[PDB]
Point group: D2
Chain length 381, copies 4
């Protein structure tokens, strides 16, 4: 297999994942049958290092995947994007950590919650961690998890990063009763007095520096993309896919409807939505590609580009959502029924919107600072 | 010289053209200086056929040029784009028409007014043209002009296209007293009982077919580019350049302010305003130029351009204009009181874009119906 | 007892009604206790003729009632407005029809489905009625219904209006499973080969004519108000009400987070102002109309046109402001129990009616502005 | 003569002022002819106290008049509202200051520049005032001016207000070369070492407290009206008026194209949607802009006090009115297409004029919106 054949296989899955969207929403977590299928065609290998049988691929092709997934099932696209990018994150961890996860089984999955909703206290050999983390999309389908939060040594915050912990050392509290992305199963992770070895903590600082241990062995270009582009993009890409899905739905339904042998108003709003969605994607995937092309040539990623990515990325979410709102309003009465696909895309996108990577202001201030000749702050870049 | 060095030389014209902006406006048409500088650097040869010394370039580079020009002077960018693209249109005329225009002096320029404000009636060996055509940008700097309209036979139209007429067979009436694009000198061409030979008419139909006569000797891929993308983009590219100009102006001004205030307010909204406009401007340009390059790449590979792509180009192009103007308005508002001065560039960029917006190729509805119809399955 | 006291009494039901919102949503119809309480304080009497113990009130006070209800429970306010204006409509039917509905018990309620999803075929003594009408909000709580349709006389439509049919002659099909307005129970009404007497049909023409049989016995100025304002307003008023509900909900929660960001202040202020604007216009137009009727004057067509352009605008404004507050609410708004997402979901469901369509209203108004003649019958 | 009389008379001034519109722009200040006619119909007496022969009128009628004037000539509506309102502001100064201004000639006019671009230093019996104040609309037509700034006692700001200064003690610098409101002649005021006595300064705080001197002789309810409503509304009213002007320019032009295609034959829903939305939005700018003023005045005329929440609501609605007017004008102007680019097209003038007006400090949206949000949230509070 290679990157392109995995994409082809994913195309083939779309119709079945689509028909399952209701059931997916019902389960409040991905159906085992779709996760298995994904796993079987190689989706999770996509951004996985080749030392573990993976494809350590071009990041643009991976998001292009998630966009397809989200274009038939919001929750499927959302979880896939997030779980997949974890196999990219784990590659920046040092060999020891990687070994524990994929040693006996390379198709092992990791979930996460990067918001600092807990902490790890220094002991001999690493960390003693406690906290309750929420929103771990797809945690129901993973054997390990990351959790974000500071390192506290003798009181006070020294580092901030992610801790890697096994399913057996955290409880999963089912509190996923929300208005959108219902089937993401983004439950809550309870960590009590769990020791985590020093080789299962990765610093963001380290990642920024290109001194993350795992890079020695995993030297493919893709493992040097900035977290600030890679992570928020994992959030925006599926949302963009949701707009594509909402668009196709509405077009189908509006097509039959306007074959009655004029209605300029209906045409305009479809042309505008189509163009805004296209602009979202071009920018999002475009900044991703500009950065990977640079790394591929051995060159370095200038701050200006990372800042442009952040502002375009929050913007992409904005215009995907605005388009979906206009396509929803236009679908009229028949979009109100609990089964109607367009209303699902609309609910899902709005749920996704609350994710922190989507806060427009945060991202615009970073880009605004850079244009105005100001020192960087916000590390989410 | 090639396309790339012409692009490079145009960068070095930018500062002087910038400084000339007010003079340009006050003239109510382009200054001889600037027209001569563009000619000398080879700008007008960009889309000109090879057999005449032209570079028959990648259409995307021509448009990058117009963008840069318009980012310092709205009127220059607007005129340059329009008169430049006419060297493209003429390539499609059959050789004889070309010979009359370039045969003695290959640097000869042509203007146009494409909206149907007259007509040609069939007679022995051509047509009898009558009409009054407005909005001929840079007409004072051309010695031929295109005029658009139907060919009428015995009462009903039997064709539609462009008539190529020399300086001496039409009158220029100065009517350019407007709120924006004042330097464009977009005056009115008056044509009375003028005979045009058939080899100086060109059907739009004949361009779509690829039956247009000039195509035989002018074989480069650029000349297979669709009229429906080339002409509207010629209008959009400069409007987007103006948005770039507006942006740079507002950032230079506002930047000196946020710095300095950085020593004992905090105006997060000044940065939101700036991040949003740069994003929307980038998007306009990516789509506008993106569509150009997709089409050209197809042609370069001896492939054909699918109808759906041509319809995306139209929806994107009118949208591009819209993104630009909307972004310029936000920037203009954000510049506050200083932007009102007659000598502040941002109010010129703003008036210019709004004046450019009234062009037919920018009507959004008309383009959106086209893309909608295609989406919906309709004709 | 009068409209102001009914109004003040409605204030008291608000806390109970707000707390019942979730139970109302789960029930998929209004809980019996809320219908009972509304009947107790006299809400259904508000637009009802005096001969039936009704208050035949100034309609601005009725709509102000629905707004208050919708600000604590979107479904309650929606159902109350619609069922409540039905007592206005019946007053226009001739005396005998009112007799049959209210003579025995004046507290009897009526539901509707006005869209023409069936028809009435002329027969001996009246009509034979057939169809399946959807979206009958509050039908579970009514013992009669209106269904909209044409009158068919020998295969050709000769009239259009409403037929009034008793519970025993139609079936209620439970099909109400929706993203919002869950508590409205807008189920479907199945009507098979049902005879309706001539006196239980009212033409819309006759309602515009002022020849509706009921005006002889019910001469209060409120019954002379135009259907084109009254009906669409019973849809818009509650929606505006929901915006008020969403606003209060968001200010309360966000207000504590703050006693712990100018951005939050801006969203809230634009939202507050756009909501206020929507209400002022919607209720202003209704009040101006009634004032003329009450003075003995006629309503000019231009006021009616304005009512309609403002009415669909009020909805747009309300829904945009809700959309902004709901976004601002962020993560908390996602829990299935969050009141703000209910308002958000209820508002967008109400938007599909059907009478919030802006184009139709705006065409009516544009035509009038352009001096074009009245064509469309509104609604 | 009363306030309704003056209004009626202003109506018959409209066509002339409309006709003058272009001449006005080119002058870069209002024509003596206009100013003279406004004076003669009694426009400037509207908010002037009765002791000076003024009408001390219902301020809603005042703002209505500026709307009307601004609906035919933006500059004229702009200058008129601003200079007219100064007769209101002067009413709050000490009786002595009113005497100096209107003692001989009750029709004398005042201009202003209210932003702190200078300062007054405490000296015996008054202040020593220095500064360069820009943007003084209509100054070429006034013989007095207000200039705003803090009072500096021993090098520290200890109060804030307006200083009243006669023409002989300041220079009018001509610098008005702008893209819009060309005819307002909003030039610069230079004041160098000018003594201003105690009684020709008015603290904003004192206006708020109701301790301003003028209240001793001017008891009419209009003078209890808040500065934070009167001053910003004077900026917004004319702008809404410009929006009314553009609306009618557009409607009469567009109507031909739409009626012509009404049978043969293109249908044009877009054009009517666009006109319905603007009309509704302009109507909404006016309802709340004038409603807040009416609600305020209705309280004062009945001896009641104005609650802070109305003043805060007034401010959110006033900057919001400006915004709505400008968004609507933008849409109408775009829609009017190529004939609207002409130097003689009124709409392009309304468009440039409204966008010039927008830069005024009283229109900044965030400041007003922060005031209103603070109040909704409990936060402690100015305005203008």
């Amino acid at each position: 297999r290679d990157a392109q054949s995995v994409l082809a296989a994913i195309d083939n899955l779309l119709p079945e994942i689509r028909d399952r969207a209701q059931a997916t929403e019902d389960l409040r977590r991905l159906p085992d049958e779709t996760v298995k299928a994904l796993d079987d065609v190689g989706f999770f290998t996509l951004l996985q290092p080749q030392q573990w049988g993976g494809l350590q691929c071009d990041p643009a092709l991976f998001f292009e995947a998630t966009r397809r997934l989200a274009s038939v099932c919001g929750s499927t696209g959302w979880v896939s994007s997030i779980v997949g990018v974890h196999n990219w994150h784990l590659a920046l961890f040092d060999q020891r950590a990687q070994e524990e996860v994929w040693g006996e089984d390379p198709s092992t999955r990791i979930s996460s919650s990067y918001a600092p909703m807990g902490a790890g206290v220094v002991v001999d050999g690493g960390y003693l961690v406690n906290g309750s983390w929420n929103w771990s999309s797809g945690c129901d389908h993973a054997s390990w998890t990351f959790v974000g939060g500071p390192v506290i040594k003798d009181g006070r915050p020294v580092d901030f990063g992610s801790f890697l912990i096994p399913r057996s050392e955290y409880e999963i509290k089912d509190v996923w009763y929300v208005v959108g992305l219902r089937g993401t199963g983004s439950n809550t992770l309870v960590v009590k007095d769990v020791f985590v070895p020093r080789h299962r903590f990765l610093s963001y600082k380290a990642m920024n520096d290109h001194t993350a241990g795992g890079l020695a062995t995993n030297s493919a270009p893709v493992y040097k993309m900035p977290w600030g582009t890679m992570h928020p993009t994992t959030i925006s890409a599926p949302i963009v896919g949701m707009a594509y899905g909402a668009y196709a739905a509405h077009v189908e339904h509006q097509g039959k409807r306007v074959r009655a042998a004029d209605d300029p108003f209906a045409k305009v709003r479809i042309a505008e939505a189509a163009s805004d969605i296209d602009a979202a994607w071009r920018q999002l995937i475009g900044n991703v590609s500009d950065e990977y092309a640079l790394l591929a040539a051995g060159k370095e990623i200038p701050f200006e580009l990372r800042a442009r990515a952040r502002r375009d990325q929050v913007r992409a979410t904005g215009r995907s959502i605005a388009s979906i709102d206009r396509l929803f309003e236009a679908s009229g009465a028949t979009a109100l029924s609990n089964e109607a696909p367009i209303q699902r895309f609309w609910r899902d996108a709005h749920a996704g919107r609350v994710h922190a990577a989507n806060d427009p202001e945060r991202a615009y201030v970073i880009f605004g600072n850079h244009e105005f000749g100001l020192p960087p702050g916000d590390t989410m870049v």
